[PDB]
Each structure stands twice: as C-alpha cells, then as structure tokens.
Design a protein around this ligand. Structure first.
Ligand SMILES: CCCCCCCCCCCCCCCCCC(=O)OC[C@H](COP(=O)([O-])OCC(O)COP(=O)([O-])OC[C@@H](COC(=O)CCCCCCCCCCCCCCCCC)OC(=O)CCCCCCCCCCCCCCCCC)OC(=O)CCCCCCCCCCCCCCCCC
Ligand SMILES: CCCCCCCCCCCCCCCCCC(=O)OC[C@H](COP(=O)([O-])OCC[N+](C)(C)C)OC(=O)CCCCCCCCCCCCCCCCC
Ligand SMILES: CCCCCCCCCCCCCCCCCC(=O)OC[C@H](COP(=O)([O-])OCC[N+](C)(C)C)OC(=O)CCCCCCCCCCCCCCCCC
Ligand SMILES: CCCCCCCCCCCCCCCCCCCC(=O)O[C@H](COC(=O)CCCCCCCCCCCCCC)COP(=O)(O)OCCN
Ligand SMILES: CCCCCCCCCCCCCCCCCCCC(=O)O[C@H](COC(=O)CCCCCCCCCCCCCC)COP(=O)(O)OCCN
Ligand code: HEC
Ligand code: HEM
Ligand code: HEM
Ligand SMILES: CCCCCCCCCCCCO[C@@H]1O[C@H](CO)[C@@H](O[C@H]2O[C@H](CO)[C@@H](O)[C@H](O)[C@H]2O)[C@H](O)[C@H]1O
Ligand SMILES: CCCCCCCCCCCCO[C@@H]1O[C@H](CO)[C@@H](O[C@H]2O[C@H](CO)[C@@H](O)[C@H](O)[C@H]2O)[C@H](O)[C@H]1O
Lengths: 85, 71, 124, 383, 54, 244, 56
C-alpha cells in the first residue's frame, strides 16, 4: 500500500499547480503573533469539552472517594467504617 | 532559650486557638473517662491524637518560617 | 464493517418513520460537529482505502471524480499541516457532499460477497 | 545512481531515515517514536556503564549502588539518568500507544506493527521490573516477592515454577544474579522487536492525523522530520534535566534506600508508578488466578482493537462520540493508576472494580457499539 | 557581510572549523562565568567561604 | 489508615539548600557534624561516610586526619599471623558504636538504631522529617495514648511510639563557632548534616544542572527557529486546481 | 543579499556550536566514570616503616 518515489501508489494526478518559495526568501516567523493568539485560541476552544468533561468527571469521583476514605478513618467515622468492613 | 518554645506558645494562643480548645476539651473528657471505673473493660477507649494532630499541624503552619528565620 | 452493512442498516432506519424522525436530525448534527467539511472533504473521502475492494472501487471512479478526489486530499493535507481550516468555497457545502464512491464500492462488494456465497453452494 | 541508493547497506539506512516518504502533515504526537528511540539509547548507554560498577551478588548489590552514587565520577548522574529515564520511557510509551489508539494506527493495514508493538510493551514491563530489583532495597525485595508469587497461581505447576524462577525458596542471591543477567539481555531483545515493528510498518508507511492516504503527498523524512524531532528531543532533555539535576528522587520510593530485609515488611508494597493501573486491575478480581488472568488480559486485549473497531473511517479526528469515549477511557486508565497505590480500604475497593469493568467494556462493548452507530451517522448525516 | 560569508561560511570546512573554535571558546568562558555567578548567589555558604577560619 | 498510623506530616521548613540555585550552608554542615559526633554517634552509625569525605566540605585535610588518627582500626596480621591494630587514615570509614545488630538491640531495649548515612533519603520528608522528629517530642502524650514499654510518644513517627527518647536539649553541645546550641538550632544543623551525608553530590549537581538548563534552553529556542526555517516552503505552499 | 543568508547561517552555526559544546561536556563528564573512582584514589600514599628491616 505504499510504493516509493516515482511510483508512490497515488491515483493519477493532473490539473494541480503547486507553488512555494525558498526558506531563504521567506520570513519563517511571519504571522506568529496572530497564530500564537488567535489560531491557538480557536484550536483550543474547539477541543476544550473533550478534555474538560472526562477530566472533571474523574476528578470529582476521586475527590469524593478520597474524602470519604479520609472520613471513615477518623473517630467520627468509626461506625460507618465498622459497617463498611 | 529555645526560640520555638515562645513561637509555639504564641501560635497556640493566637491563630490556632480554636484547635487548642478542641484538644483541651478532648483531654478533659478522656482523663475523666479514665477516672471512671470499668474503663479497662470498655470496648472503645477514646484518645486525643486526632485533635493533637490538628493543633500541631496548625502551629507548624504559623511557625515554621518564623523559627528558621531566627536560627 | 462493510459499506454494504452500513448502507443496508441505514436503509432500514430511513424506512421506519419513527426511527428516521429521531435518527436523521442526530445524524445531521453529528456530521456538523464532525467537522470534516471544514477541511473541504466529502464524507466518502474519509473511507479507509487500504483494502483490495476499496482499491478496486477507486480504480473504477471516472477520471474527473478521481482527479478531484486527489485534489481534495492534497488540499486537506495542506490545511492539516498548516493548522488552518477551509474558508469560502473550500468549505464543503451540504449539497456538495455527494456519495460519489458509494455506488462503486457497493458493486465491488456485491460481487465479492456473491463469490463467497457461491463458493459454498451445495447441489441439492 | 547516488551511492545512498546503490550500496545495499547505505540504502537500508536511507530507506528509514533519509528518503523514507512520510505524510506531510504528521503532528507532534508522531514524535514519541523518536523519543522512545532516544530513551532506549540513553538506557543502553547508562545501563552498560552502571554494569561496569555494579555487583550482582546480594551481599554487595545495594552497596555497589551506593559506591556508584558516592565514589564513581559522575556516578550519581549515570544512576539518576538511568532511574529517571525508566519513567520517561513509560511516559513516552503511553503517549505513543495513546496516539496509536486515537488515530486508528492499529487498523489495517497496520495490524502487524501494532501487534508486535504490544509485545514490545510487555518486554519493557519485564525489563523495568527486573531492573528495579537490582538495587536490592526494601521495595526491590518485597516487590519481587509479591510479583513473583503471582506465578504460584498457575494451576498444578505454579509453586514449582516460582521456586525455579527464584533459584531457591525465596527471593535471594540466585534471583538477584539471574535478574541482572536478564535485565542486561532484555533491552537487546526489545531493540530487535522495535526494529521489527518498524520494518513491518514500512509496507504501509506512517498513518497520519487525518486518517487518509498520504500516497498523494509525501515529504522526505530528512530534513523535515529530522529537524522537527530535534524540537521534542530538546523539550525532553529539559524535562530530563529538571528531574535528574534538581529533583532526582521525586519519582522514587524512599524505602528503596533501606537495604532489603526479609524479616521486616514495608508499610505498603506497590509497584513503580507505571505498573500501577495493572495492579489495580489485579486487585479488582478477588480470586488469585482470576486476578492474574485479568491483569494479563488488560494488556493482551489491545490485540483485539483491529477487530472490535467497526468503523469505516480510520482514527478519531472526525468522530465526536469516539473522541468523548476515548477521553473517558484515558482518564479511567489514570484513575486505575491512582487506585493501584491507595490502601485496600473503603470506598476504593468498589471503585477499583467499577474502573476495571469500564476498562474492559471499552474494548468489548462500547467501542464496537459507538463505532457501529457512527458509521450510520456518517452515512445518513451526509445524504 | 559578503566578506564574512566568504571567509567563514561559504566553505563547509571553514564553517565547521569556526563552529568548533567557537564551541571551545564558549565552553571555557561559560565555565568561568557560571563559576563566578554560582559563588555570588551562594556567598558565605560554601567551604571556600569559611575555609579561612581553619 | 488513621493519621496516627501514618504519622503527622512535617512542616516544610525553609532550608538554605531549598532553591534551584542554593548550596548547603557549610557552616551549618560543620556544626551538624559536631552534633552527630557528640550526641547521635552514641547509638547511630554513619558507615557510608569516610574521613576523606569531610575534607573540603566541613573540615580541612589536617582536621580530618586528626579525627582518623585518634582511632584504631584492624590492620593486616603480623608476620606470625597474629591480629594487629593501626591508627586511622583518611580512607577509613567512620566507625560505628556497636559491633553487630545484636549488641545494638541489647543497648536500646530491643530497638535497632538505623545507620544515618541514607536516612534523609530513606524517609518521606527528608531534612524536614528529621527536624520535626527531633524537635517534636511533647512533654506529655495526648490523653488516651498507651505507650508500649520503652517507647516514647512522637507524633511524627508512624504509630506514635518510637524507641528513641528525646536527646537534644538546650546546651548538650557547645558549638566551636559560638552559636547558641538550642534544641532547634542543633536539630537544624544535624538535619542539614544528614542531608549532606545522604546526597553529597548535591551542590555540584545543582550547579551542573544550571549549566545544562541554560544550554538546553538555548538549543530549544534555536531548534524552533531552524525547524520553522526549514518547514516554511511546505507551510507556505499554495495550489491552483484546474479540473481536467 | 549576503546579509540575509548570513543571518540564517548564524542561527544554524550557533545551534551547531552549542551542540558541539554540549556533546563535549556530555562525553567528558560521562566517560570520566571510567577513570579511578574516589575510593581507588584514596588507596595510594602507602606509608612503610624501616625499623624492622635488617641490613642485607
Ligand atoms: C514528555 C517528553 C517531552 C516532549 C513533549 C512532546 C509533546 C508534544 C505533543 O505531542 O503535544 C504537543 C501538541 C501540539 O501538537 P500540534 O502538532 O500543534 O497539534 C497536535 C494536535 O493534533 C492538534 O490539536 P488541535 O489543532 O485541535 O488543537 C488543540 C489544542 C491546541 O494545540 C495547540 O498547540 C494550539 O488544545 C487542546 O486540545 C487543549 C484542550 C483544552 C483544555 C482547556 O499539543 C496539543 O495539541 C496537545 C493536545 C492534547 C489534549
Ligand atoms: C485526557 C483526555 C484526552 C482526550 C483527547 C480528546 C481530543 C483533544 O482535544 O485532543 C486534541 C487533539 C485533537 O487533534 P485532532 O488530530 O483530533 O484534530 C486536529 C484539528 N482538526 C480536527 C481541525 C483537524 O488530539 C490529539 O492530538 C490526541 C492524541 C492522544 C494522546 C493520548 C495520551 C494518553 C496516554 C494513556 C495511554 C493508555
Ligand atoms: C553534535 C556535534 C555538532 C558538531 C558541530 C560542528 C559543525 C557542524 C554544524 O554545526 O553543522 C554545519 C554543517 C553544515 O550545515 P549546512 O548544511 O547548513 O551548511 C552548508 C552550507 N554552507 C557550508 C554554505 C554554510 O553541518 C554538517 O556538515 C553536518 C554536521 C552536523 C553536526
Ligand atoms: C545533540 C543532538 C543534536 C545535534 C545535531 C544537530 C545538527 C547540528 C547543526 C547541523 C545542521 O543544522 O546541518 C544539517 C545537519 O543536520 C542533520 O543532518 C541532522 C538533522 C537533525 C539532527 C538529528 C535528527 C533527529 C531525528 C530523529 C531523532 C532520533 C532520536 C533517537 C536517538 C544539514 O542540513 P540539511 O541536511 O537539512 O541540508 C542543508 C545543506 N546541506
Ligand atoms: C546520557 C544522557 C544525555 C543527557 C545529557 C544532559 C547533560 C549531561 C552532561 C553533564 C552536564 O551537566 O553537563 C553540563 C553542561 O550541559 C551541557 O552543555 C549539556 C547539555 C547538552 C545536551 C545535549 C547535547 C549532547 C548530548 C548527547 C550527545 C552525545 C554525543 C557525545 C557524548 C555541565 O557542564 P560541565 O562543566 O559539566 O562540562 C564539562 C566541560 N566544561
Ligand atoms: C541512646 C539512643 C539514641 C540517641 C542518642 C539517638 N538515637 Fe536516633 N534512634 C534510636 C533508636 C533506638 C531508634 C529506633 C527507634 C525505633 O525505630 O523505634 C532511633 C531512630 C532514629 C531515626 C529513625 C526514626 C525512623 O523514622 O525510623 C532517626 C532519623 C534518628 N534516630 C536520628 C537521630 C539523630 C539525628 C540523633 C541525635 C542528634 C539521634 N537519633 C540520637 C536511638 C538513639
Ligand atoms: C529499556 C532499557 C532499560 C530500562 C527500562 C531499565 C530500567 C531499569 C530500572 C527501573 C532500574 C532500577 C533503577 C534504580 O532505581 O536505581 C535499573 C537498574 C539497572 N539497570 Fe537498567 N534498564 C534498562 C536497560 C539497561 C541495560 C541495557 C543495562 C545494561 C546492563 C542495565 C543495567 C542496569 C543496572 C546495572 C542497574 C542497577 C543499578 C541501578 O539501580 O542503577 N539496564 N534499570
Ligand atoms: C521501544 C519502544 C518503541 C519504539 C522505539 C517505537 C518507535 C516507533 C517509531 C520510530 C515509529 C514511527 C514514528 C512514529 O509514528 O512515532 C513507530 C510507529 C509505530 N509504533 Fe512504535 N515504538 C515503540 C513501541 C511501540 C509500542 C509499544 C507500540 C504499540 C503498542 C507501537 C506501535 C507502533 C505503531 C502502530 C506505529 C505506527 C503508527 C503510525 O505511524 O500510524 N510502538 N514506533
Ligand atoms: C531506523 C533505524 C535506521 C536503520 C534502518 C533499519 C535497518 C533495517 C532496514 C532493512 C530492512 C529491509 O528494509 C527494506 O529495505 C529496502 C531497501 O533498503 C526498502 O526498499 C525501498 O527503498 C528502495 C530505495 O530506497 C526501493 O528500491 C524500494 O522500491 C523501496 O521499497 C524497503 O522499503 C525496506 O522495507
Ligand atoms: C568520543 C570520545 C573521544 C575521546 C574523549 C576522551 C574523554 C575522556 C576524558 C575524561 C576527562 C575528564 O576530565 C576531567 O573531567 C572533569 C569533568 O568530567 C573535570 O572536573 C571539573 O568539572 C566537574 C563537573 O563537570 C567538577 O566535578 C570538578 O570539580 C571540576 O574539576 C576535570 O577538570 C577534568 O580534568
């Protein structure tokens, strides 16, 4: 499923003209400030839910479990611990 | 004299007064409970370790930096 | 899964009035959030191609459809590496999202599956 | 014809590091492969050097590690580099595996590199476990004891196998000396399998974040990915530096600075952090043999991803529901890790069982269901 | 700029020689600079600072 | 587990060596050696430290040779093969108070005082744990605590009952540099000294780390420029498509 | 312009220079592990008596 240079396995290409300029002719950091602020904001905003929802859920689960465990091993939690074992 | 003696006393009377009271109340109860007979044949003997820990943790938070500053 | 499977199950849903009433709106939202149209792809450009059946279906595309698919893949690759999205006419509009490949792959698979069945015939 | 293509030896190197045709749109998650190669080279260099100063005999092992720390020039650095790089190796391997799962790198036609990959992961676990025993501190001994006793669960012959592994009736000198020999060997085996999975990959080439063919648009590996790899090499070296020079013991257990004592048992015997999720899975099953099977299955089940993923599309970039499911799967894997090092107490016992069920149900139920439904939504949604 | 390019950069042999010579200079000067800076931020604490008492 | 079973967690004290760019205070290290020698060394060994290790850290070559030469070490047998002793040399390790574990336990009501050469790395907390433990013996155990015989209450020690009694009291040592030897001061100095004993490369390591951080950061910056430079023709590529 | 090219080679050259200096430091510190360790260097300077040694 992959060939090599000259016969890579692409369907025939026709009609596309491609253009680019030398690395010495270009500013490598052109538009960096706009990218760093606005592009990163767009990309992050669009993926935020997929990180926030599972992280926040599993952190809540952990927080509740760790707080209960801590409470069960206090004086106040003696009776509830006795039942739990 | 040990600078810590005064710093710890100050922190107990001051920012850690609520914790100091709880420890004090606990000790009063436990000593009284030990005084009562048939304490040795009780199921649950209370200690004051928890309250002590809460107090010491508090004193240490208010003292650590101050103590090392004078050594 | 086979394209045949996907197409048949989808047709069962589209037949049932109840089912279509609840599934079609969900599927349209799914496609909007999927966001492949924002890289100028058509849905069929995403189908896995490294399979004998799919390679055969792609070889049967008319030359025009084939040349345009090559351009959309190259253009989407350039958006991907640049971390940009399509704008303007590069965004695939819903009416341009045509199933250009589905008929070819369904024919390739029809023969492939008939061959499998007929390899297992038992004279009665 | 250029020499790099004409000469058969040069041409092999050329095919992998220079003319190798790569997709033009690999993102930074395609850099973990070269970081893993870097970790492997650091571990070989530091490991062989520690072997020049280490003594595998149980009467001398722990002290030979102190001699390395105290007397050997730069011994502290070589030791801490080796110990911390073991953790970095697992961070990079989890990132590389997570990349592979998110982007569908296990799908045809890349089943074979993925399957050899699963074996690489098992060899890394064994390598790291044996190397940790070599210190012969308290965690070394007690971790070897409890992990090697899991083999006792094998029916009929299990006890005999354990005595055979230990070379005696408990973990002692024979076990330490054999772990040294095998710990030296296993990284060479691991390097061979790493090479095999790359040769297997070379038939399809790298996948890419869009999940489509890259045969339409290839870039040479050099100079583009050579220079892009340098960025993450230096980012890795900065993290390495912060641990090795400024916090060399953050990732370790203080008990491993106490010499092994078969009499005294440490407060809590836990594996190194990177093995913790598998330990939580084992605790979840009450049966000994059940637990061992589950723990092994948790790794071997990776082999069925090519089958249970029913999607007609490769990877998650365009699949919102799959992306949510993947997020929950990853976070659950981290919670299992945390539960591997808590005490066996309420309410963590039940929570560990629920997280174990979720771990397995991803492969067996959720991914097959979600991938089926998404196929239908793509079709109906784009009509 | 042309002159500088022509002498130090154009020939790779010259470029590599310049890089290696600069690396040598950097290494020696950076060593001395860090040593002095380290001694200033940790003044009064190191053995060299208390050695004179003994 | 209960908090008592864990032990109270020590405060984070501001040690001079805390700080990416901070060495130990060597005057504190020297004072801490004197506390070790006059108090701890009665029960605790420091077996991983040789006399040469003190030199140019806490003491001059001559001071350390003087300490070594006051002791007797086992020599090679004489010509009739009889045992002999020799005076200590800088290569010798600091000798421990007891000949074996059994003797150590017999002198300490069954408890075995650990060797202190790695103690700062072998306990969670490090210097803070040592300082907290040494200074954290309350006059009276919290009401309700039952100590086993030969145990002392200390909340920092897991379970609360430690076989080591309080040993640092104001003026048990007379420091040679005129520092007031209070309980707190002695605990701070000996905790610093023991931290040095556990990690004697500490000062060199952090300075080498500073050099590495600077070089690696500059290389990271330059690697970003170079990658962007090399990739710009790919990032900047444009297409015109005319469908055939 | 030559100035334009020279700037990019200054970046490449600096990077090559720090990589050379970093490699040298790495190699030197690392390989020094093979030179005599501190405990070996502590075993020189043998002192020998002469009173016991007879003539001939
Ligand atoms: C350890 C050893 C050290 C070496 C470090 C190497 C790590 C580099 C790497 O793989 O991650 C960098 C990587 C940047 O890589 P990239 O090639 O620019 O884009 C890769 C993503 O596919 C592109 O993702 P995207 O274009 O959709 O952008 C998403 C990203 C924004 O990514 C940006 O960098 C912007 O923001 C987030 O996802 C943040 C989530 C929201 C939280 C609130 O950072 C991420 O995007 C991490 C997101 C993971 C969740
Ligand atoms: C923690 C939860 C992570 C969930 C990720 C959800 C997707 C997301 O937002 O990621 C950003 C990006 C999204 O990238 P993308 O490639 O999907 O989209 C790029 C942008 N568009 C869609 C416009 C083309 O995802 C990644 O880069 C994912 C790599 C996953 C690595 C996981 C490591 C975990 C290790 C555990 C091993 C077992
Ligand atoms: C790690 C060791 C680093 C060695 C540095 C010695 C000089 C080499 C270097 O930095 O690259 C310059 C040279 C050339 O870089 P270049 O290819 O940009 O220079 C060619 C163009 N001229 C000569 C006009 C400037 O690199 C090499 O020759 C390969 C060595 C890699 C290091
Ligand atoms: C310390 C580690 C890094 C040190 C080496 C970096 C190169 C130093 C500068 C030299 C340089 O930039 O010149 C190029 C050499 O790079 C090269 O030829 C190599 C390019 C990148 C170096 C390493 C590649 C890493 C990729 C995989 C990482 C593997 C980690 C596993 C151990 C040639 O420039 P040009 O060749 O582009 O042409 C340009 C015309 N001659
Ligand atoms: C094996 C693990 C690799 C990780 C390397 C990180 C630093 C290791 C070197 C030791 C060190 O701290 O060097 C500092 C300088 O940092 C530096 O300059 C080193 C940072 C450079 C990192 C990458 C450069 C090359 C690494 C590998 C190349 C391998 C090829 C040959 C060995 C101290 O400096 P010093 O005063 O100790 O130095 C002596 C000459 N003055
Ligand atoms: C005469 C006896 C004695 C003296 C003096 C003494 N110790 Fe100990 N120490 C012990 C014994 C016994 C233990 C074991 C306690 C136990 O494990 O219950 C111990 C334990 C310790 C521990 C370990 C506690 C733990 O976490 O396991 C440290 C640290 C310690 N000592 C430091 C010191 C320092 C620092 C000094 C003095 C400056 C000191 N000791 C003086 C007898 C002594
Ligand atoms: C994948 C490669 C490797 C990994 C993941 C690895 C992992 C480990 C680990 C986790 C330890 C315990 C470290 C500690 O806490 O002190 C260790 C110790 C050791 N390893 Fe390796 N190792 C690898 C390769 C090698 C190689 C190739 C050698 C060659 C002999 C080696 C020799 C040693 C030695 C001698 C020790 C004991 C000394 C010490 O603890 O530092 N290792 N290794
Ligand atoms: C020593 C450990 C390993 C090393 C050195 C290593 C190295 C690499 C390298 C260099 C690549 C090509 C570049 C890249 O995609 O990042 C790669 C690709 C891959 N690796 Fe690994 N790998 C290792 C372990 C693993 C493991 C444990 C797995 C699977 C469980 C795995 C599965 C793969 C797959 C499927 C690919 C192809 C991904 C794609 O390009 O789409 N590897 N590996
Ligand atoms: C990554 C570590 C660097 C070292 C490289 C790994 C060493 C082992 C590599 C050899 C294994 C054989 O690997 C095989 O080599 C041949 C030629 O070299 C390659 O052959 C490929 O390149 C050559 C020209 O470059 C073409 O003739 C051919 O059409 C193409 O398939 C295969 O794609 C590769 O699979
Ligand atoms: C590719 C290999 C080619 C052959 C290269 C041969 C390399 C082997 C030579 C080892 C040389 C070690 O040389 C010796 O190194 C150490 C650092 O390691 C230096 O030591 C100097 O810096 C180190 C930190 O880097 C400090 O701990 C030390 O107090 C200071 O004196 C010595 O000043 C130097 O004399």
């Amino acid at each position: 499923y992959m060939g090599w240079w000259g016969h890579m396995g692409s369907p025939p290409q026709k009609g596309i003209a491609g253009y680019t300029i030398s690395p010495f002719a270009a500013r490598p950091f052109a538009g960096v400030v706009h990218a760093a602020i606005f592009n990163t904001f767009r990309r992050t905003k669009n993926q935020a839910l997929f990180v926030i929802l599972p992280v926040s859920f599993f952190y809540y689960v952990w927080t509740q479990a760790s707080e209960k465990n801590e409470w069960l091993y206090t004086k106040a939690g003696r009776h509830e611990l006795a039942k739990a074992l | 004299p040990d600078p810590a003696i005064a710093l710890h006393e100050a922190a107990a009377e001051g920012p850690c007064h609520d914790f100091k009271h709880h420890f004090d109340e606990c000790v009063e109860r436990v000593t009284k409970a030990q005084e009562a007979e048939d304490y040795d044949h009780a199921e649950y003997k209370e200690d004051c370790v928890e309250e002590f820990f809460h107090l010491q943790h508090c004193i240490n938070d208010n003292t650590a930096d101050k103590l090392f500053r004078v050594l | 899964a086979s394209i045949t499977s996907v197409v048949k199950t989808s047709e069962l849903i589209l037949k049932s009035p109840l089912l279509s009433k609840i599934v079609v709106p969900l599927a349209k939202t799914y496609v909007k959030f999927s966001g492949y149209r924002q890289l100028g792809f058509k849905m069929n450009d995403l189908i896995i191609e490294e399979t004998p059946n799919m390679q055969l279906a792609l070889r049967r595309l008319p030359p025009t459809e084939s040349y345009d698919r090559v351009y959309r893949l190259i253009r989407a690759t350039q958006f991907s590496l640049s971390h940009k999205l399509a704008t303007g006419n590069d965004i695939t509009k819903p009416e341009e999202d045509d199933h250009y490949l589905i008929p070819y792959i369904l024919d390739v698979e029809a023969e492939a599956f008939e061959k499998d069945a007929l390899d297992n015939l038992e004279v009665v | 014809m250029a020499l790099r293509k004409k000469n058969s030896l040069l041409n092999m190197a050329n095919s992998y590091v220079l003319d190798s045709p790569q997709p033009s749109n690999l993102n930074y998650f395609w850099n973990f492969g070269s970081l893993l190669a870097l970790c492997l080279v650091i571990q070989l260099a530091t490991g062989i050097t520690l072997a020049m100063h280490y003594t595998s005999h149980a009467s001398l092992a722990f002290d030979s590690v102190e001699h390395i720390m105290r007397d050997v020039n730069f011994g502290w650095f070589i030791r801490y580099a080796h110990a911390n790089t073991a953790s970095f190796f697992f961070i990079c391997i989890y990132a590389h595996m997570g990349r592979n799962i998110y982007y569908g790198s296990y799908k045809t036609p890349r089943v074979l590199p993925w399957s050899i990959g699963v074996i690489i992961f098992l060899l890394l676990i064994i390598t790291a476990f044996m190397g940790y025993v070599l210190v012969f501190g308290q965690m070394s001994l007690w971790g070897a004891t409890v992990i090697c006793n899991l083999v006792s669960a094998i029916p009929w012959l299990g006890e005999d196998i354990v005595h055979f592994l230990w070379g005696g009736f408990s973990v002692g000198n024979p076990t330490l000396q054999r772990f040294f020999a095998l710990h030296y060997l296993m990284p060479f085996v691991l390097a061979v399998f790493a090479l095999l999975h790359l040769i297997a990959l070379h038939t399809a080439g790298s996948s890419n974040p869009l999940g489509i063919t890259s045969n339409v648009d290839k870039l040479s590996m050099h100079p583009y990915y050579s220079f892009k790899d340098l960025i993450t090499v230096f980012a890795f070296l900065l993290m390495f530096t912060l641990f090795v020079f400024f916090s060399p013991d953050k990732l370790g257990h203080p008990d491993n600075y106490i010499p092994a004592n078969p009499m005294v048992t440490p407060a809590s015997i836990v594996p190194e952090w990177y093995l913790l999720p598998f330990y939580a899975i084992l605790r979840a099953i009450p049966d000994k043999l059940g637990g061992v099977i589950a723990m092994v299955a948790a790794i071997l089940i990776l082999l069925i991803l090519p089958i249970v993923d029913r999607s007609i599309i490769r990877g998650n970039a365009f699949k919102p529901i799959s992306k949510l499911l993947f997020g929950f799967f990853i976070c659950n894997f981290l919670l299992l890790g945390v539960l591997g090092q808590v005490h066996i107490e309420p309410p963590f016992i039940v929570l560990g069982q629920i997280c174990t069920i979720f771990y397995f149900s991803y492969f067996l139920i959720l991914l097959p269901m979600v991938s089926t439904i998404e196929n239908i939504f793509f079709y109906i949604g784009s009509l | 700029a042309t002159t500088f390019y022509n002498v130090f950069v154009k020939r790779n042999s010259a470029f590599v020689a310049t890089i290696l010579a600069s690396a040598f200079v950097f290494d020696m000067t950076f060593e001395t600079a860090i040593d002095n800076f380290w001694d200033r931020i940790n003044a009064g604490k190191q053995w060299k600072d208390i050695r004179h008492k003994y | 587990m209960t908090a008592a079973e864990h032990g109270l967690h020590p405060a984070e004290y501001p040690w001079p060596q805390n700080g990416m760019l901070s060495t130990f205070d060597h005057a504190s290290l020297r004072r801490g050696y004197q506390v070790y020698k006059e108090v701890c060394a009665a029960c605790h060994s420091l077996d991983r430290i040789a006399w040469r290790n003190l030199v140019g850290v806490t003491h001059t070559t001559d001071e350390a040779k003087a300490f070594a030469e006051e002791l007797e070490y086992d020599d090679e047998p004489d010509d009739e093969g009889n045992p002999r002793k020799r005076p200590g040399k800088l290569a010798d390790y600091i000798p421990g108070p007891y000949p074996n574990e059994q003797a150590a336990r017999a002198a300490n009501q069954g408890a075995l005082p650990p060797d202190l050469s790695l103690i700062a790395k072998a306990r969670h907390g490090g210097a803070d744990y040592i300082f907290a433990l040494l200074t954290g013996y309350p006059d009276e155990p919290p009401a309700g605590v039952v100590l086993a015989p030969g145990m002392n209450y200390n909340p920092y020690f897991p379970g609360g009952g430690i076989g080591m009694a309080r040993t640092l009291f104001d003026g048990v040592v007379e420091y040679e540099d005129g520092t007031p030897a209070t309980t707190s001061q002695m605990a701070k100095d000996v905790a610093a000294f023991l931290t040095w004993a556990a990690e004697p490369e500490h000062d060199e390591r952090k300075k080498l780390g500073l050099k590495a951080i600077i070089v690696i950061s500059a290389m990271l910056g330059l690697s970003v420029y170079i990658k962007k430079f090399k990739w710009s023709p790919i990032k900047n590529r444009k297409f015109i498509y005319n469908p055939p | 312009t030559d100035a334009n090219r020279l700037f990019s080679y200054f970046m490449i050259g600096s990077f090559g220079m720090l990589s050379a200096a970093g490699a040298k430091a790495t190699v030197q510190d690392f390989l020094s592990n093979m030179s005599a360790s501190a405990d070996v260097l502590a075993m020189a300077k043998v002192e020998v008596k002469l009173g016991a040694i007879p003539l001939g």
